[PDB]
Design a protein around this ligand. Structure first.
Ligand SMILES: O=P(O)(O)OC[C@H]1O[C@](O)(COP(=O)(O)O)[C@@H](O)[C@@H]1O
Ligand SMILES: [K+]
Ligand SMILES: [K+]
Ligand SMILES: [K+]
Ligand SMILES: [Mg+2]
Ligand SMILES: [Mg+2]
Ligand SMILES: [Mg+2]
Lengths: 517, 517, 516
C-alpha cells in the first residue's frame, strides 16, 4: 500500500526501480484541484457533482464574462457547496478564485459569413488594423486587435501569434495604425482569440482600469484568492495589494508567471506574492515551448523552499475537452507536476467548456493520488529540513517535530487546530506522507487551506462551547470523526495532534501522539 | 551553457531551483528519435528532410500493410539515407525497425468502406458477432471481431474497449458466438479498429503464424531491430529469438510492454530481451491510465540499471497530428521521459499520418536536448557506479574509467572504436555528459547504436590498414574530424579515446586522454 | 560548538572545517566512570572527584573484601549527599559493581607480598598447581589459581601475565605442572592476572564467589553490574537470575573481554541492558591490532540498539604517574566519544594513581570538545533512517522532540520520567542539546548516567494532588536547574516532554516552551 517498498530505497534510481502498479494508494489525495467554471460546469447540479468528483477551488476567468455573470456563478458555487453543509463531518469547503484579465491582447469577431471561422494559409498575406470599423469584420485579409500601440512596439520581421500559439505571422510592413504580415504557419481563425507578441516591450499595465473594477468586485463578492495575470515584477504585485486594500487584505494573491520578464524577476515576485501559478498557456508562447518544463520545475522548487503555494496550470488534460480519456502525455504531465511538488493542479477548458468536465476532475484526482504514493518522502523531507533555517519560532519547530513524528509512527493523520491557517501551512511545507486535517472555525482559512498540499480543511460549526481545554478536545474529536468517516484511519490507529497553550493565532506549540478512539 | 550551474548543487531540490531557461544547451543531442513511417512520411523526399530534422530510427508497423508495401518503405529509407553517403563525415546512419502485429484484436469494416463511420451513443445496445458474414458489414447494431474465443474469456459485466480505449462497452449477455453490450461512452466508430479486453485472460499466442512470416521477412530485408508486441513473458521472447534464428541472430529484440502480465513479469523479460519499449498506447488501456507513469518510470529505471536500451513510445506529441505546435502536457511528457532516463523517444501517428511530421521530429529534437542539459549528472553517475557490480571484465572497467575521466576534464567527447557496438554500449550505460562518438566499419552496429543514449554512430568507409596501430590512428582521426565538423569540439579541446590492444570484439582495454588536433 | 563544522555536506568537508578556536558548550554529555581505590577512597577526594566530573563510581570485586567495598560505598554516598542540601546543584552519582569473573591469577613471590623477580628472555619457568608454592613464587617456580590449566593448554601454547607484558611458551605439559620458556620477560609481582588466548578455559562465567558478590550488590543497593568475561547470552541470564526479583532494576552491563564474547556479541547485547568494551583483557585475548575494530563495531551496534556502551581500559594510563596524558591518550578519549560511546572509564588512573583529579578533569575536557566535533546531521539522519517504524507513542514523541530541538536550536530537552525510559528514548537519537531528566526516583536518576546526554535531576518536592501543577512544578524545577548550571537563559527556547497521566509508559506530549 502506498509504495512503502519504493520509499525505503537508498537511491533515486533504486526507488524508481521499486515502483509497483499493483501497490494501491491511500484514500487521501493531497494535491488540490482547481477547476475553471464556464458553460459546461456553471449549473448548480453539475457543481454538486464536481465537488463530489474532487473540485477544491473554483476559478472564475475575468478575461470573459460580465460582473453579473460571475456574480451568478459564485452564487451557484456557494449553493452547491452549502448543499452539503447539513453534515459538517462530510462537508468539504470550496474556495472561490478570481483570475484577472490582465494586459491581454485579443482579436475581433469574424464576418459571420456562413461558418464563422476563416482558413489562413501558409504564405498568404494578412493585414492587421486598429481601425474600429473592422472589429467585427475580421477575415483572411483584414484582422482587428485590442492593442492600441501595437505598431509602436513591433518591428518589421517580428513574429505575432494569434491563438494559443497555433497561428504565426511575420510582420513585413509597419504602418501608422496598420500592419502587413505574411502567414507563416496557418490554420482556421476564430473570434476573440488571444494574441501574443514574444520579444516585444508591450506597454500595457499589469493592472488596467477594468482589472481594478474586477478586483474591487472580488472584494465585494468575498472571494478567497486572486490569480493575477502577467505579473512582470514585485511592483505589479504591490499594485494589486493596494487595490484589494484593507477590506481585501486577507485575500491571497497568487501571481501568474506567463512571460519572460516574470521568470527573470521570479524571486522578487515570489517574495511579494502569497503564492505562484505556473501559467503554461501564455508562458509556452512567450518563451520557447521546449524551455517551459525548466521554468515549471524551477518555480515549483523555489516555492517549496519558500513554503508558499504553487499551482501547475494549463493544458494538463486538453484531450479531454473532446474525449472521455486523456492521452498518455497528459497522464504523464499531471503525475510529474505532483512529483515536481505542485500544491495544486488546474483545469481550464477541460471543465469550463468541454464535453467531459467530471471525467477530467476525476482523472486528476486519480493520478494525483497515485503520484503522491510514488513520492520519495525520505529524500524530500530530508532535503527540506536540511534547507530549513534554524529559528526560535515555536510553531515552526513544533511543525517539523510533528512531521518527523508522523513518519516515525506512520500516523494516519496530523490533526492541527488553526485559526488563521498558518499552523497547518507550516506542517504542509515539510511535506508529510500523512494527511493534515486542519480544524478551524474561520470559514475563509478553511477555503484558503486548499492552496497548500496535504491540508484537508474542516470547518467546525460548533460554538465555543465550554472551557478552552474541552473546546480543544471537542475540536480534536471532531477531526477524529472526520478521519474515521472519510476513511483516513480507524479506531486504534495512531495520530499526531497540534494544539496551542491558549486561544489566538501564533500560540501553537504542543504536539501529542494520540490513539484514535 | 548546458546548466553547469544546476548540476553542481548538493540536493535535488537545489538542483531544481537552479534551473535556468536562459542557459542554452550543447549542440549534441543524445536521446535517440524513432519515427513511425506511413502515408505522411513514406516519400524519399520527406524521408531526406526527416533524417535532417533528427530521425535516427525508422519504425515499420506490421499491424498494417503488406510485405510488398513495407519492402518499398525500406527501399526509400535506404535511398534517402544513402543520399548523404557521399560525405562520410556528415553521414548519419539510420536504423530500420520492424514492429510486429502481435496478438491484437481488431474490428471489421463498416460498409465495405475503408473510411465511412457510425455514431455510437451512450446507453445504446450493440451486438458483437464472430459470424464471418458480418466482417465487412459492421454498424451501430452489429460489430464483428478477429478474436475467436472472445466469448470464452469474457464475463457479463466485463468492459470492452474499441479505438485506443475511446469507445467503451459493457457486456450484458454472453452468447456462444455473440455478445450483447451496452455502449457506456460512445463516439464515432471506424473500420479495422483495435480492441482491448483488460482483466481478461486472452489466449492468443505472442507469436502468430503471420508474426513468424513477418519476422522471417525482417531477416530477409536486413532489419536492424524488432519491436515485439504484447510480450507477456520470457518464453515469448525466446520464441522470437528462435524464429529470427542464426541468420537473424544479430537483430536486436526490443520487447514491448503493453499489458498487465508483461509488467508483472518484467524482470524475466528484460533478461531475455536486448531492450524494452514502454508501449503506453495499449498499456494505458490494459491497466488504469493513472498507473502508467509508475510502470514507465519503473521500467526505465530497471533498464538503466541493467544497461539495456529503453524506449518511451506512444502519444508523446498527439496534438501535433493536426496542429503545428504541441500542448504544454506534451512538451512536459517528452522532457520528463528523457529525465526519467529513456534512451529513445518515439513518434507514431505524429509522423506516420499527421499533417506535421517534420515539426514533430524537430520538436522532439529540441526538447530532448534541453532535458539532457537539465540532467543532474553527479547524482546519476554516482548512483550508477555505486550500483555497478564489481567484475573483472576489462572493457567494463575501462568504460567506467573513461566516463569518470570525461567528467573530470569536461571532455568534448568520448571516442570509442567498436566492431560489435558493445564497447560503446558499455560507456553509454554510465551516462556521460559528453557525447560518445562510436567509430565502426560494421554498418549494422552503426545503425543499432542509435538504441543507446549518447552514442553518435560513425561509419568508417576507409579500408583496413595493415599496421593495426595506424589503422587505429586513422579511425581515431576520422572521429576527430567528425566532432570538429558537427561542432562537438574544437582544436585544442580535450577528448577521451577508447581502443583495444588488438583486432576483434572483446579486446577494448585502453583509455587515452588526448588533445584535439 | 563548531556549528560551522556540522553544516558541511561531506564528512571530509566537515573534517576540514574543524576549528580549535571555536569553544564548546558548558554541557558535557559523555558519562565518566571512575574506579575507586587507595587514591580516591577518602570522602574528601570523592567530593573533589564529583566536582571534577565523576558520574559513576566503579567497585572492582577482583580485589578487596565485602567489608572494604561496603565502606567505599558508604563514603561515595557521604560525599554525594554532602551536596544534597541544594537540589538544584545536586549531581546524582551511581554505584557500579564490577565482578571478579573467571579470572586466573598467580600467587605471591616471597613472605613479602610486594617484592619482585626478574624473568629473562630464554630462561625456563616451571608452573605448578601444587598449593605448597602458592606463596613461594620465584624465577623458577610459579603457582596459579586455575586447576584445569594442564587440560586446556598444549605444548607450544602461549601464556601471558601482568596485562600481557610477560609471555611464556609451554614446552612440556605435565599432570599438575608445566615447563615453559620465557619469551619476553620483565619483573614479576604478586597476584598477577593470567591470560590464555586460543584456549577453551572451562571456568564458569558466574562462580560461587561471584554469586555472593552479586547478592551483596543487591543488599548494598548498587545501581548497575559490570559482568566480567561474558561469553554468551546464557551467561547474562545466570546473572539476571542471581540478582533476582529484588535486584531486577539493577542494570546489567556485559563486559566483552574475549574472543567468544565478540563472536556472539549480538546474542549478548540482546540479553544485556548495556555493554562495556573491556580493552584490558580483550587486547590480550585477541590480537592488539584488532581491538579498535571490535571497539567500533560494538559501539555502533549498541547505538543502533539504543543500549548504553562504555569504552573502558587504559584511556589515560600515562596519568597514573604523570600530571598530563600522552598525545595517543588524548586521541583515544576523543575518538571513543566520536565512535559514539555513552561513557568513558578510568581504572588505575583513579583507583591508585598519583593524579586522580587531573585524569577525571582531562576526560571531562576532551569529551566536551569531542562532542562539539560531532557531525550531528549525518548521525541523527542515519539513526532516524535506521529507526524501525513503530506505533509506540513515546518512541515517536522522542524522535519528534530531538528533531524539534535541532530545528530551534533548543537550550535543552526537558523530560519527566519515572523509570528513565522516556529520557533513554530521547538519548538514543543523539541530540545536540542536553537532556534534563526530571525524576522522583533516585535510582533512575543515578542510572541515567549510562546514557549519553542525560543530566539526571532528582526532584525532592512532594507530589501535588493536581497532577497538572505537579508537572508544572517539576518542569519549572528543571527550568531553574538549566539556568543555574548555565545551559540556557530566560528567553531561550526549550523542548518539554510530559505524559497525559501518571505512571511509566504514558509519555506522549511535546511542547516548545520559552524559558521564564
Ligand atoms: O519515562 P517513564 O518511566 O516511562 O515515565 C514517563 C511518565 O512521566 C510522566 O510524564 C509524569 O508522571 P509521573 O509523575 O508518574 O512520572 C507520565 O505522564 C509518564 O507516563
Ligand atoms: K485570465
Ligand atoms: K503493432
Ligand atoms: K574485575
Ligand atoms: Mg493566460
Ligand atoms: Mg500496441
Ligand atoms: Mg579485565
Amino acid at each position: 500500500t502506498q509504495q512503502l517498498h519504493a520509499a525505503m530505497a537508498d537511491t533515486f534510481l533504486e526507488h524508481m526501480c521499486r515502483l509497483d502498479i499493483d501497490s494501491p494508494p491511500i484514500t487521501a489525495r493531497n494535491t488540490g484541484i482547481i477547476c475553471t467554471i464556464g458553460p459546461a460546469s456553471r449549473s448548480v447540479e453539475t457543481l454538486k457533482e464536481m465537488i463530489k468528483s474532487g473540485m477544491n477551488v473554483a476559478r472564475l476567468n475575468f478575461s470573459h464574462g460580465t460582473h453579473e455573470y460571475h456574480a451568478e456563478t459564485i452564487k451557484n458555487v456557494r449553493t452547491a457547496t452549502e448543499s452539503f453543509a447539513s453534515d459538517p463531518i462530510l462537508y468539504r469547503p470550496v474556495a472561490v478564485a478570481l483570475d484577472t484579465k490582465g494586459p491581454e491582447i485579443r482579436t475581433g469577431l469574424i464576418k459571420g459569413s456562413g461558418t464563422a471561422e476563416v482558413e489562413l494559409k501558409k504564405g498568404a498575406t494578412l493585414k492587421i488594423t486598429l481601425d474600429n470599423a473592422y472589429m467585427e469584420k475580421c477575415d483572411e485579409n483584414i484582422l482587428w486587435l485590442d492593442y492600441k500601440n501595437i505598431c509602436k512596439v513591433v518591428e518589421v520581421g517580428s513574429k505575432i501569434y494569434v491563438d494559443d500559439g497555433l497561428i504565426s505571422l511575420q510582420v513585413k510592413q509597419k504602418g501608422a495604425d496598420f500592419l502587413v504580415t505574411e502567414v507563416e504557419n496557418g490554420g482556421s481563425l476564430g473570434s476573440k482569440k488571444g494574441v501574443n507578441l514574444p520579444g516585444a516591450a508591450v506597454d500595457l499595465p499589469a493592472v488596467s482600469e477594468k482589472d481594478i473594477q474586477d478586483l474591487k468586485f472580488g472584494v465585494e463578492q468575498d472571494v478567497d484568492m486572486v490569480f493575477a495575470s502577467f505579473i512582470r515584477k514585485a511592483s505589479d504585485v504591490h499594485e494589486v495589494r493596494k487595490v484589494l486594500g484593507e477590506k481585501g487584505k486577507n485575500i491571497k494573491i497568487i501571481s501568474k508567471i506567463e512571460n519572460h520578464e516574470g521568470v527573470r524577476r521570479f524571486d522578487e515576485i515570489l517574495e511579494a506574492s502569497d503564492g505562484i501559478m505556473v501559467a503554461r498557456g501564455d508562458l509556452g508562447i512567450e518563451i520557447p515551448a521546449e524551455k517551459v518544463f525548466l521554468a515549471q520545475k524551477m518555480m515549483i522548487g523555489r516555492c517549496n523552499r519558500a513554503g508558499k503555494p504553487v499551482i501547475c496550470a494549463t493544458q494538463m488534460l486538453e484531450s479531454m475537452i473532446k474525449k472521455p480519456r486523456p492521452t498518455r502525455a497528459e497522464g504523464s504531465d499531471v503525475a510529474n507536476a505532483v512529483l515536481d511538488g505542485a500544491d495544486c493542479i488546474m483545469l481550464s477548458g477541460e471543465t469550463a467548456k468541454g464535453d467531459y468536465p467530471l471525467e477530467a476532475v476525476r482523472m486528476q484526482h486519480l493520478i494525483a493520488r497515485e503520484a503522491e504514493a510514488a513520492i520519495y518522502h525520505l529524500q524530500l523531507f530530508e532535503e527540506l529540513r536540511r534547507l530549513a533555517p534554524i529559528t526560535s519560532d515555536p510553531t515552526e519547530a513544533t511543525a517539523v517535530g510533528a512531521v518527523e513524528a508522523s513518519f516515525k509512527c506512520a500516523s494516519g493523520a496530523i490533526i492541527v487546530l488553526t485559526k488563521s491557517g498558518r499552523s497547518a501551512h507550516q506542517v504542509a511545507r515539510y511535506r508529510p506522507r500523512a494527511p493534515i486535517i486542519a480544524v478551524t472555525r474561520n470559514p475563509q482559512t478553511a477555503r484558503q487551506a486548499h492552496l497548500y498540499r496535504g491540508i484537508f480543511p474542516v470547518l467546525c460549526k460548533d460554538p465555543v462551547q465550554e472551557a478552552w481545554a474541552e473546546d480543544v478536545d471537542l475540536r480534536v474529536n471532531f477531526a477524529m470523526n472526520v478521519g474515521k468517516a472519510r476513511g483516513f484511519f480507524k479506531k486504534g490507529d495512531v495520530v499526531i495532534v497540534l494544539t496551542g497553550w491558549r486561544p489566538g493565532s501564533g500560540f501553537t506549540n504542543t504536539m501529542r501522539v494520540v490513539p484514535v478512539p
